[PDB]
Amino acid sequence: GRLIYTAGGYFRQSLSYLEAYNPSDGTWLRLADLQVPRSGLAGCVVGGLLYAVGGRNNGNTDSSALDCYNPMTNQWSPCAPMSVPRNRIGVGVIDGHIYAVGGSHGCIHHNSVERYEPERDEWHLVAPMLTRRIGVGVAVLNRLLYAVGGFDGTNRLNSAECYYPERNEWRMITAMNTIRSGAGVCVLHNCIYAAGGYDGQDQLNSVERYDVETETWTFVAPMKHRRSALGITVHQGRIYVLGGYDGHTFLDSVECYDPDTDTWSEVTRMTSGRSGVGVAVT
Ligand SMILES: CCOP(=O)(CC(=O)Nc1ccc(S(=O)(=O)N(CC(N)=O)c2ccc(N(CC(N)=O)S(=O)(=O)c3ccc(OC)cc3)c3ccccc23)cc1)OCC
C-alpha cells in the first residue's frame, strides 16, 4: 500500500510541508519538514527513497539542491547538488537514475540535462535538449525520456522532444494541440498525459494523451479545476493532480482521473492550498 507524497509548494511563501495521502482510506499524514522551504521543485522515487529536486526558496534563490527522504526513518538527508540551480524543473527516472531536465536559474533558461547516480552521489551532464525549457513536463516511456512543453524564455511551448539514453541524443516529437508551461506530465498505460498548465493567457483544464504508436496527441476528459504548477502522479492505474494555481486561487483540490471511464472526480483536499509541489508515490 503505497502513499502519494507531496513535498514543499508555495502559498504566499515557499513551504516546507511534506505530506502523504492514502487513497485506500482518505487519510493524510504529516511527515518531516524539508530543511529549506521550496517551490517549483520536482519529486521522484528511487529504491523506495523520496527525492526532492531543485526549485526555489521564495533570501529568494533558485535551488541546485537534491535532498533524499527515507519513509522508514522519516528523515531528510542532503545529496550531491546539481551542476546548476534549476527552478521549475522536470525530472524522470531511468534505471534508478534521476534525470534533471531544464528549469531556470534567474533569467537563464536551461536546455541542459544532468543525471544522478544514487549509488554514487554523483551528477553528470548528458546531451542538452534542442529547446530551453522551464516549467517542463517529464515522462519516462519505453526507456525513453520525454520533455513536454514549458517556457523557453521567449515563447510558451507546445513542442516535445525525446531523449535516447543509449545514443545520448534528443529528437523532436509531435507537438501538442495546446501550449502548456507548468503542466502535469505523467505516464499511464503506455501513454504520456499532459494535464493543465498555462497557455500564455489562461490556466488550462484540458488534458491531452500522446499515443506513441500513432505519434498523435488526442484530448481526453478535462479536469474540474483548471490549474498550472500542479502536482501529478500515478497510483494504482489512475492519475492524481494535486493543487496548483487557477489564475486567482492556490488550489487544495486533488482530482483523480479514471482512464476506463474517462472521468475526473475530486477525491480529497490537501490540508491547505498550494502550488509548485513535488509529487511522488512509494
Ligand atoms: C501579471 C498578471 O498577474 P498573474 O495573476 C497572471 C499569470 O501569469 N499567472 C501564471 C501564469 C503562468 C504560470 S506557470 O505555471 O506556467 N509558471 C511560469 C513559467 N514560465 O513556467 C510557473 C509559475 C510559478 C511557479 N511556482 C514556483 C516558482 N519558483 O515560481 S508556484 O507554483 O509556487 C506559483 C507562485 C505564484 C503564482 O502567482 C501568484 C503562481 C504560481 C511554477 C512552478 C512550476 C512550473 C511553472 C511555474 C503560473 C501563473 O500572476 C502574477 C504573479
From Swiss-Prot:
**Where expressed (tissues)?**
Broadly expressed, with highest levels in skeletal muscle.
Kelch repeat ranges are 3-48, 49-96, 97-143, 144-190, 191-237, 238-282
**Annotated site location: Sensor for electrophilic agents:** 107
Effect noted on mutating residue 40 to C:
In a lung adenocarcinoma cell line; also in NSCLC cell lines; strongly reduces interaction with NFE2L2/NRF2 and reduces repression of NFE2L2/NRF2-dependent gene expression
Q: What is the effect of changing residue 156 to A?
A: Loss of interaction with NFE2L2/NRF2. Abolishes repression of NFE2L2/NRF2-dependent gene expression. Loss of interaction with PGAM5. Does not affect interaction with SQSTM1/p62
Localisation = Cytoplasm; Nucleus
* Effect of mutating residue 58 to A: Loss of interaction with NFE2L2/NRF2. Strongly reduces repression of NFE2L2/NRF2-dependent gene expression. Impaired interaction with SQSTM1/p62
Q: What is the effect of changing residue 198 to A?
A: Loss of interaction with NFE2L2/NRF2. Strongly reduces repression of NFE2L2/NRF2-dependent gene expression. Abolishes interaction with SQSTM1/p62
Provide the record's note on post-translational modification.
Non-enzymatic covalent modifications of reactive cysteines by electrophile metabolites inactivate the BCR(KEAP1) complex. Accumulation of fumarate promotes the formation of cysteine S-succination (S-(2-succinyl)cysteine), leading to inactivate the BCR(KEAP1) complex and promote NFE2L2/NRF2 nuclear accumulation and activation. Nitric oxide-dependent 8-Nitro-cGMP formation promotes cysteine guanylation (S-cGMP-cysteine), leading to NFE2L2/NRF2 nuclear accumulation and activation.
Q: What does the UniProt entry list as the effect of changing residue 10 to A?
A: Loss of interaction with NFE2L2/NRF2. Strongly reduces repression of NFE2L2/NRF2-dependent gene expression. Loss of interaction with PGAM5
Residues modified as S-cGMP-cysteine are: 107
**Record's subunit section:** Component of the BCR(KEAP1) E3 ubiquitin ligase complex, at least composed of 2 molecules of CUL3, 2 molecules of KEAP1, and RBX1. Interacts with NFE2L2/NRF2; the interaction is direct. Forms a ternary complex with NFE2L2/NRF2 and PGAM5. Interacts with (phosphorylated) SQSTM1/p62; the interaction is direct and inactivates the BCR(KEAP1) complex by sequestering it in inclusion bodies, promoting its degradation. Interacts with NFE2L1. Interacts with BPTF and PTMA. Interacts with MAP1LC3B. Interacts indirectly with ENC1. Interacts with SESN1 and SESN2. Interacts with HSP90AA1 and HSP90AB1.
Which family, according to UniProt? Belongs to the KEAP1 family.
Quoted from the entry, the domain comment is: KEAP1 contains reactive cysteine residues that act as sensors for endogenously produced and exogenously encountered small molecules, which react with sulfhydryl groups and modify the cysteine sensors, leading to impair ability of the BCR(KEAP1) complex to ubiquitinate target proteins.
User: Function, please?
Assistant: Substrate-specific adapter of a BCR (BTB-CUL3-RBX1) E3 ubiquitin ligase complex that regulates the response to oxidative stress by targeting NFE2L2/NRF2 for ubiquitination. KEAP1 acts as a key sensor of oxidative and electrophilic stress: in normal conditions, the BCR(KEAP1) complex mediates ubiquitination and degradation of NFE2L2/NRF2, a transcription factor regulating expression of many cytoprotective genes.
Protein known as: Kelch-like ECH-associated protein 1
Q: Which organism is it from?
A: Homo sapiens
Which lineage do the record's taxonomy fields give for this organism? Eukaryota, Metazoa, Chordata, Craniata, Vertebrata
